[PDB]
Amino acid sequence: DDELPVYQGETTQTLQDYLMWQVELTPFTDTDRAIATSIVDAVDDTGYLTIQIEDIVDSIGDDEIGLEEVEAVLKRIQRFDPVGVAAKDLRDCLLIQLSQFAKETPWLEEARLIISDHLDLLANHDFRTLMRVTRLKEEVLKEAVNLIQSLDXXXXXXXXXXXXXXXXXXXXXXXXXXXXXXXXXXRSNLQEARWLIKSLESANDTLLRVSRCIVEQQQAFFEQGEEYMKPMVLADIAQAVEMHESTISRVTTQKYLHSPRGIXXXXXXXXXXXXXXXXASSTAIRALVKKLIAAENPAKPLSDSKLTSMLSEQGIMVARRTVAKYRESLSIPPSNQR
Amino acid sequence: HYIGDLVQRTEVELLKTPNLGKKSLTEIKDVLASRGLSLGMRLENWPP
């Protein structure tokens, strides 16, 4: 309705909204505005990625309209407010961000064009042999690299994500004797509707009792003090109150339990039974696998088979494949550096 | 000479002169796409 501040909206501006605003105000032709609108949607909240170019060209359905037309227009779009916008590959991002250094920057212009244009793939590790490639030495190259490292990446300045999306918790786990104890914190027609409320008010009091109950059984199923969490099956919680698996997983999926470590509520009931006599499921396998891979490789061992042998020494019956596959995942440099 | 006197023209006005063709228009569109970006204004006046 009106005359009050109903949550009508804010109409904030994202990056694509703002870029399109910036396109509205620039001297594009009828067609070039179609290519521009075609590119600004391709852009991402991350900036740099304008995804595939030749799909931008082919998306228009031929009829002339070469590659060069989208290329020029593309450059000009890449030139709008947040300096380096879009482009591709980060290389051209840093070349567009480097396009304006005012040209009055000492030593930076040339060196920066050489480093940023080409050979930047080898600049990851360190200088080393690159120092011999560009003939530079001492701090001449190091100061240019200070500028290159001073650039930042793409957009993510427009952002428009003021919403942190907090957790709000649901049930509090007051820590007891090296464990956890639940408390669960935080005329006649409508009169007959009043009655439904009595039932809703009676169920509202038991809503906390379900959280404290399932929470108590969840604390009894997995040891808190132990590394990760003891392996459990939904059949235990389904054994206690005799509730269906999907229902319990739904309650733990919706609500989020706050313990002293982890905010992480439905992950405390999901585990494997390992299917082995000698033995914390995949939690400690992948967790402690990445932990053992954290301190290792004095220089560049890059050996996942040695880590698989170390896992087999612990009595987990490693397959040298599964263990290495789960260990090398999630950004793990293992086996990649070989 | 220079830029400005070139920078304000509609592509419909520039498209017809001898020897340009469709290619050179996109060529100058790419070259001048960088830096200036403009390819139009009414501006004000000129110092020279």
Residues forming beta bridges with residue A258, ordered by sequence position: A172
Place of tokens 């011999």: A132
Contact A56, A38 (CB under 8 A): yes
Contact A309, A303 (CB under 8 A): no
Burial (CB < 10 A; 0-12, 13-18, 19+), residue B25, is middle
Q: How far apart are CA A327 and CA A320, in angstroms?
A: 10
CB nearest to A69's CB, from B26, B34, B41: B26
Secondary structure (DSSP) of B1-34: --SHHHHS--HHHHSSSTT-HHHHHHHHHHHTTT
Residues forming beta bridges with residue A181, ordered by sequence position: A174
* Specified resolution (Å): 3.4
Report chain B residues whose CB lies below 8 A from the CB of A29.
11
CB nearest to B33's CB, from A66, A76, A99: A76
- In chain A, DSSP finds a helix count (H) and a strand count (E) of 14, 3
Structure tokens at A263: 């905010």
What does chain B come to in residues?
Answer: 48
Q: Give the H or E element holding residue A171.
A: strand A171-174
Measured CA to CA in angstroms, residue A147 lies from A104, A113, A128, A237, A338 at distances of 14, 12, 18, 58, 31
Q: How determined?
A: cryo-EM
What residue ranges in A256-323 does DSSP mark as E strands? 257-258
A interface test, pick of B8, B9, B32, B34 with most A CB neighbours within 10 Å: B34
Residues of A with CB under 8 A from a CB of B: 26-27, 29, 66, 68-69, 71-73, 75-76, 79, 99
Q: Do the Cβ atoms of B38 and A27 come within 8 Å?
A: yes
Contact A218, A269 (CB under 8 A): yes
Q: SS3 of A328, please?
A: helix
